Amino acid sequence: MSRSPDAKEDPVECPLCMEPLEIDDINFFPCTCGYQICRFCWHRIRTDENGLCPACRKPYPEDPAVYKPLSQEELQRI
Ligand SMILES: [Zn+2]
Numbered sequence: 001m002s003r004s005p006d007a008k009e010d011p012v013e014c015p016l017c018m019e020p021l022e023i024d025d026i027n028f029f030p031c032t033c034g035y036q037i038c039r040f041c042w043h044r045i046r047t048d049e050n051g052l053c054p055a056c057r058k059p060y061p062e063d064p065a066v067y068k069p070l071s072q073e074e075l076q077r078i
């Protein structure tokens with residue numbers, strides 16, 4: 001009953017377990033490559049797993065193991 005070509009919108013669905021993504025869960029991905037999961041999917045990857053990305057193979061952005069920028073590369077030491 002409208003003149004617009006798009007008068008509706010669907011919610012996102014966790015493509016890992018299949019569930020209703022909450023509002024703050026929409027952009028809740030453990031990785032910035034898009035591979036997004038819900039809370040029941042991330043509560044297991046960052047727990048009994050290496051908190052890594054099963055889609056691009058990367059450490060979730062949030063200090064997963066230790067994180068290292070570029071400390072001593074040759075270890076000068078004394
Ligand atoms: Zn899920």
Ligand SMILES: [Zn+2]
Nearest residue numbers: 031033053056
């Ligand atoms: Zn990723």
